[PDB]
């Protein structure tokens, strides 16, 4: 391949392979032969977020426009991929165009959620939120700062000295009902096709 691959994923037939380069472009490779089958693009249709401490806009941010996990469907005809973005993607394999794009979480305290930041928070020098507000807590323990400066996905939450990035690490399909689950920063999310399990009381007094 010509660019930096990661997060490999095979078809269950084992004759085609989904690859995620640094460009975001997923490629599909033959295994019985050597050439590339076709490649689907993800650097355009990825919802990425601009952090409050970001100094570049999300349209030309290279934060999260690749995929940290790829999975084939149980026909091998669809693929759900997920990265360090707010966006989870469902590409069709032979028709080669994404079917649906999914938010994992819509949270202001999660960092890369928002596409566009609100300009009322961009003050004279600095963000309005990047000011250390832990020093005004009534409690001593919450006023105590233990944050080592440049910790990225380290041990504890308080020691980033940052908001948590919206990132989704691991992606898998269910065999049966095509349900896909992805363990996010928030936790394990479940999408499914088990529709109308939404419980519906009827004729309530």
């Amino acid at each position: 391949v010509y660019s930096d691959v990661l997060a490999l994923s095979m078809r269950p037939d084992g004759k085609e392979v989904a690859v995620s380069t640094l460009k975001g472009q997923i490629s599909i490779f033959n295994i019985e032969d050597a050439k590339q089958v076709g490649n689907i693009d993800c650097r355009k249709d990825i919802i990425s977020g601009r952090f409050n401490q970001d100094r570049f806009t999300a349209k030309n941010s290279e934060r999260s426009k690749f995929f940290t996990t790829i999975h084939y469907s149980f026909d091998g005809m669809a693929i759900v991929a997920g990265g360090n973005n707010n966006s989870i993607c469902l590409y069709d394999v032979p028709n080669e165009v994404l079917l649906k794009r999914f938010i994992v979480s819509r949270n202001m305290a999660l960092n890369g959620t928002l596409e566009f930041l609100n300009s009322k928070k961009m003050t004279e020098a600095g963000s309005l939120d990047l000011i250390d507000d832990a020093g005004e807590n009534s409690d001593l323990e919450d006023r105590i700062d233990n944050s080592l400066p440049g910790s990225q996905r380290g041990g504890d939450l308080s020691t980033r000295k940052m908001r948590p990035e919206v990132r989704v690490t691991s992606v898998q399909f269910s065999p049966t009902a095509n349900a896909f689950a992805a363990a996010s920063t928030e936790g394990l999310l479940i999408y499914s096709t088990n529709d109308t399990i939404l419980f519906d009381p009827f004729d309530l007094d």
Partner: peptide, 19 residues
């Protein structure tokens, strides 16, 4: 780093103070 030009393997880093 502030302009968002650099990366450490996989991840573009925004923070200049990276250990």
């Amino acid at each position: 780093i502030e302009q968002g030009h650099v990366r450490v393997g996989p991840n573009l880093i925004n923070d200049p103070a990276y250990l």
